[PDB]
Design an enzyme around this catalytic site. Structure first.
Site, PDB file in Angstrom:
ATOM      1  N   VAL A  91      97.249  66.524  67.325  1.00  0.00           N
ATOM      2  CA  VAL A  91      97.073  67.828  66.700  1.00  0.00           C
ATOM      3  C   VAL A  91      96.659  67.614  65.253  1.00  0.00           C
ATOM      4  O   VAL A  91      97.342  66.910  64.501  1.00  0.00           O
ATOM      5  CB  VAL A  91      98.360  68.665  66.780  1.00  0.00           C
ATOM      6  CG1 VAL A  91      98.067  70.119  66.451  1.00  0.00           C
ATOM      7  CG2 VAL A  91      98.989  68.535  68.151  1.00  0.00           C
ATOM      8  N   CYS A  92      95.540  68.215  64.864  1.00  0.00           N
ATOM      9  CA  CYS A  92      95.053  68.134  63.493  1.00  0.00           C
ATOM     10  C   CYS A  92      95.580  69.337  62.725  1.00  0.00           C
ATOM     11  O   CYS A  92      95.096  70.458  62.906  1.00  0.00           O
ATOM     12  CB  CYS A  92      93.530  68.089  63.459  1.00  0.00           C
ATOM     13  SG  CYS A  92      92.854  67.701  61.830  1.00  0.00           S
ATOM     14  N   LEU A  93      96.571  69.106  61.871  1.00  0.00           N
ATOM     15  CA  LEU A  93      97.156  70.151  61.047  1.00  0.00           C
ATOM     16  C   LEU A  93      97.229  69.664  59.608  1.00  0.00           C
ATOM     17  O   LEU A  93      97.518  68.491  59.356  1.00  0.00           O
ATOM     18  CB  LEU A  93      98.553  70.535  61.545  1.00  0.00           C
ATOM     19  CG  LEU A  93      98.823  72.034  61.667  1.00  0.00           C
ATOM     20  CD1 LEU A  93     100.238  72.284  62.148  1.00  0.00           C
ATOM     21  CD2 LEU A  93      98.575  72.734  60.349  1.00  0.00           C
TER      22      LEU A  93
END
Ligand SMILES: Nc1nc2c(ncn2[C@@H]2O[C@H](COP(=O)(O)OP(=O)(O)OP(=O)(O)O)[C@@H](O)[C@H]2O)c(=O)[nH]1
Ligand SMILES: [Mg+2]
Lengths: 156, 62, 78, 173, 204, 156
Positions: A91-93
């Site tokens: 997940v790219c956060l």
């Protein structure tokens, strides 16, 4: 040294005593038969009132030895159909991003809540995977239909 | 005028503990509330059991 | 004219704020943002589900005393 | 004349449609304002270098009381003049409504936007503020029924468009 | 617009989209493939040039900061699709003088589009260094359309010329020597504007 | 024998020296089992692309042979190849930040040629269209190649 283990144990205690309704943050037991705090298995419920509603998505979480200095790596398993989720599931956060919005104050509960609020707020300006972004831009209702189909597939 | 009425603050011991771990100051406020009991220490919970406890319900209703 | 309101953060934190029925809400907003060393842009505020504008006033929504306000952190994907 | 074209003259009340038609018809300027009731049909004849050209001008009523069969006057129209008043901003603000009513019946016809009463010193609708005709691809002319300024340019443009002869000119006979 | 092969149906759809663009949320414009579809599928087709360019002019008139890369790609793509149909070496004066009404309407719509987009996002176009050639070619099109002997088109071009001249003057009202950074961009083509103004001067 | 030497530092003239052997020597030498190596070979071949008639024909036939051998493999997912190609060109971001390339003129021209061949799947067209219409500074540098590629994509 022991700061990481102490922090993980204390936040696990807090989660057991107090946690949001619908979430799971179970630390996987080490194969020998003891707690393995490095690897956690979590479950995030799709926010209500959204096509993601009605589903519970799994998420593995790996911590580093320098935690909370460095953020944990979160990976949906199996990978989700989201513009900001890599094909491998990572997940790219920004919060999880080490050099953008990382602070030792943020805890597992806040990370999970941020991930939940990310599902309905994709950042298509800078997508992470090609299929989700393409379907999102081409036809939006097709994206909603796919999201609902997977949520039904991932339903409890 | 706009002002603040009250802001919660946990025990000083938990203040020091949060400082040690660099946690938020109000991290331990949960255990300082009513209906709090001793800290059970078994954590014999697997992901399957946690999923089962949900019983297929994960959303509150009005 | 001067009522208390409950703001529930995303950290199991509850705070009571005294405000008028005509004064702008943003004054409170920044405060809750600076509670944990956070700027204004980071946090998000919800009351009765929908989003609350910075310059909005409780008069439009008729926020009664001790009403519940939820605060979310808006995530930015990459 | 055998070549006849139907011209629809629309616009707010008091903008000078009847006076504009009467100046061509007889050369006299009307100083009193008598509101038109419904429509009046007047034949105008011009002598171009290619022969006579006849416009059956349907001068309509700009007052809502006297509208009559308003949009039913535009059926089978072949050219149009929307007239407003440069001394009144409200007349120019209503040009979109007249254009809408006109083009809902006549999809593709030549249209001239005429700003009348430009000989009055106190001009409220300044030239820079007249930009409606651009995105609608209409012609625009500042005219004056009292001074005969740009008097025949609207009809000349309409005749060139309808006949199809850009090198057409009016010759008095 | 993506499956129909019926000319009147697609033309009606574009005509209604032109009206929808006045009020619809910007998300439906800049967060989808509407601009690309208008530029490539309909702009090049002769029977869809005018309405597609009107839609692009409506889009270009939106002044908002949240979307600035979409305006940048709205310009480069449109210009590249425009020099394949209106070559830079075309004498728009003579061609317009003896041409069909569709072509004249297209010339007027092109003047409107260029004027609107330049007036709005000249700063955005200038900031990018690699877009200098595209800006120069847009100015060349503006100069070519300024030669047409139509009063309305010339006024449309003249308002942009006046806007640019006023902006450059307000930057620095002194004669060229250093030179202001924004004036150096237009130096190669300012004498052309001066020649145009001297050549088509109106009666006082 | 010198195919590897050319691949190390590709140059337009070095491609010519191989003569017609370059059509299959590049295809044979490259390991097409893993899409990453296919993408690397494609980028290296197309980097020396030039408008000169002789060079462009050699480049295009080499690319056609390489993709023909690459696409006729059951153990070869096309979507992975497309995602890696987009990642390398900088149009898309990656979990591990692989440094992008400078000029996309050659890769874009090679893609434009490839889109018009039969072996190219009719399912990867939307992804390329979405990520080529995607605004990016690296693309506006080469406007002509981007425009030609977009016209070709809208043809299909
Ligand atoms: N100063 C000046 N007055 C003008 C000019 N043209 C028309 N008028 C005056 O404007 C008044 C209104 O013009 P009319 O033609 O009679 O009214 P209308 O255009 O027919 O409008 P309706 O009959 O209500 O539909 C006339 O009484 C004229 O005296 C002009 O060019 N200059
Ligand atoms: Mg009258």
């Amino acid at each position: 040294s022991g700061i990481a283990l102490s922090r993980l144990a204390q936040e696990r205690k807090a989660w057991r005593k107090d946690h949001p309704f619908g979430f799971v943050a179970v630390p996987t037991k080490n194969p020998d038969g003891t707690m393995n705090l490095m690897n956690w298995e979590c479950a995030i419920p799709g926010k209500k009132g959204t096509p993601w509603e009605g589903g519970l998505f799994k998420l593995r979480m790996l911590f580093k030895d320098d935690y909370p200095s460095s953020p944990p790596k979160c990976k949906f398993e199996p990978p989700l159909f989201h513009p900001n989720v890599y094909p491998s599931g990572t997940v790219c956060l920004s919060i999880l991003e080490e050099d953008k919005d990382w602070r030792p104050a943020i805890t597992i509960k806040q990370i999970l809540l941020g991930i939940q609020e990310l599902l309905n707020e994709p950042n298509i300006q800078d997508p992470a995977q090609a299929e989700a972004y393409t379907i999102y831009c081409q036809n939006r209702v097709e994206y909603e239909k796919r999201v609902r189909a997977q949520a039904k597939k991932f339903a409890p | 005028d706009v002002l603040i009425v009250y802001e919660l603050t946990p025990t000083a011991e938990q203040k020091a503990l949060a400082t040690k771990l660099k946690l938020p100051p109000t991290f331990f406020c949960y255990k300082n509330r009513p209906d709090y009991v001793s800290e059970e220490e078994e954590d014999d919970e697997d992901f399957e059991t946690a999923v089962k406890k949900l019983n297929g319900k994960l959303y509150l209703d009005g | 004219e001067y009522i208390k309101l409950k703001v529930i953060g995303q950290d199991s934190s509850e705070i009571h704020f005294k405000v008028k029925m005509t004064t702008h809400l943003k004054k409170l907003k920044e405060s809750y943002c600076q509670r944990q060393g956070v700027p204004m842009n980071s946090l998000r505020f919800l009351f009765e589900g929908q989003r609350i504008a910075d310059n909005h006033t409780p008069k439009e929504l008729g926020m009664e005393e001790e009403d519940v306000i939820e605060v979310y952190q808006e995530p930015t994907g990459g | 004349p055998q070549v006849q074209f139907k011209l629809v003259l629309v616009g707010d009340g008091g903008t000078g449609k009847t006076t504009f038609v009467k100046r061509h018809l007889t050369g006299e300027f009307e100083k009193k304002y008598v509101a038109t009731l419904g429509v009046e049909v007047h034949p105008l004849v011009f002598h171009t270098n290619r022969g006579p050209i006849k416009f059956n001008v349907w001068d309509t009523a700009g007052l809502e009381k006297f509208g009559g069969l308003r949009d039913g006057y535009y059926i089978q129209a072949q050219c149009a003049i929307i007239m407003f008043d440069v001394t009144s901003r409200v007349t120019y603000k209503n040009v979109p409504n007249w254009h809408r009513d006109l083009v809902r019946v006549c999809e593709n016809i030549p249209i001239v936007l005429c700003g009348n009463k430009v000989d009055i010193k106190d001009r409220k609708v300044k030239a820079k503020s007249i930009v409606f005709h651009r995105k609608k691809n209409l012609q625009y002319y500042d005219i004056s029924a009292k001074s005969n300024y740009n008097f025949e340019k609207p009809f000349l443009w309409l005749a060139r468009k309808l006949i199809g002869d850009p090198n057409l000119e009016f010759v008095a006979m | 617009m993506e499956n129909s092969q019926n000319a009147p149906l697609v033309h009606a759809t574009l005509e209604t989209l032109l009206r929808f663009l006045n009020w619809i949320p910007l998300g439906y414009i800049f967060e989808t493939k509407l601009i690309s579809t208008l530029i490539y599928k309909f702009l090049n087709v002769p029977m869809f040039r005018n309405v597609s360019l009107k839609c692009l002019t409506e889009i270009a008139g939106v002044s908002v900061s949240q979307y600035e890369e979409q305006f940048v790609t709205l310009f480069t793509l449109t210009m590249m699709q425009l020099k394949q149909m209106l070559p830079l070496n075309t004498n728009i004066r003579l061609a317009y003088s003896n041409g069909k009404d569709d072509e004249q309407n297209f010339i007027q719509n092109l003047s409107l589009f260029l004027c609107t987009f330049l007036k709005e996002h000249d700063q955005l176009i200038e900031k990018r260094l690699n877009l200098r050639e595209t800006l120069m070619e847009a100015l060349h099109y503006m100069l070519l359309v300024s030669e047409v002997e139509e009063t309305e088109i010339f006024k449309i071009c003249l308002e942009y010329w006046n806007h640019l001249a006023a902006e450059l003057y307000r930057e620095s009202p002194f004669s060229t020597s250093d030179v202001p950074p924004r004036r150096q961009l237009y130096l190669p083509m300012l004498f052309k504007v001066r020649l145009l103004m001297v050549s088509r001067m109106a009666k006082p | 024998a010198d195919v590897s030497t050319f691949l190390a530092f590709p140059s337009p003239e070095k491609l010519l020296r191989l003569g017609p052997k370059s059509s299959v020597l590049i295809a044979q030498q490259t390991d097409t089992s893993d899409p990453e190596k296919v993408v690397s070979a494609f980028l290296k071949v197309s980097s020396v692309f030039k408008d000169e008639a002789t060079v462009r024909m050699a480049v295009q036939d080499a690319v056609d042979a390489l993709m023909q051998k690459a696409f006729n493999s059951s153990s070869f997912n096309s979507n992975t190849f497309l995602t890696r190609l987009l990642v390398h060109m900088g149009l898309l971001k990656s979990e591990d930040k692989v440094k992008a390339i400078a000029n996309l003129y050659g890769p874009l021209m090679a893609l434009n040629h490839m889109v018009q061949q039969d072996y190219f799947p009719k399912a990867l067209a939307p992804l390329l269209l979405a990520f080529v219409t995607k605004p990016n500074s690296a693309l506006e540098s080469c406007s002509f190649a981007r425009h030609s590629l977009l016209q070709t994509l809208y043809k299909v």
